[PDB]
C-alpha cells in the first residue's frame, strides 16, 4: 500500500483523537474488511464516502 485503498469499495473517515484520520473502507470487491489509522498529514487515497478500487487510486505500493 501507498496512497491507495487496499480493497475496492467506499472509503470513509471516522474519529481522530488528535491529528489523525480513521480509515474505514467499505469493500464492494468482497467480504474482506480493511480498516486502519492513517494520520491526517498523510496524503490520503481520497475523501470519505468515496468509491475507489484495490490499489488503484493515487499511488500504488
Amino acid at each position: 500500500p501507498a496512497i491507495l485503498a487496499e480493497i475496492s469499495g467506499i472509503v470513509s473517515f471516522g474519529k481522530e483523537t488528535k491529528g489523525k484520520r480513521r480509515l474505514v473502507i467499505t469493500p464492494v470487491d468482497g467480504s474482506d474488511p480493511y480498516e486502519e489509522m492513517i494520520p491526517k498529514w498523510r496524503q490520503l487515497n481520497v475523501f470519505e464516502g468515496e468509491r475507489v478500487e484495490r490499489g488503484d487510486v493515487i499511488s500504488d505500493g
Partner: protein, 59 residues
Amino acid sequence: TGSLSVDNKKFWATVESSEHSFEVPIYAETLDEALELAEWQYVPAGFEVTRVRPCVAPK
C-alpha cells in the same frame, strides 16, 4: 492488563509520549476492532498514537 483480545493478525501502532517514541503491536480479532483499540486504548493512558500499519498478509 487492558484490552488486547487475540493475535490472529498483527497490527502495528507507533506511539509517542512526552519524549519517548516506540512501536507496539495491537491485538484484536477484526481490523476495525484493532483500529478502535489502537487509539481508544492508548489515548486514555496519556500515550498519543503517531501512526499505524496493519500487517495482515492472507494466510
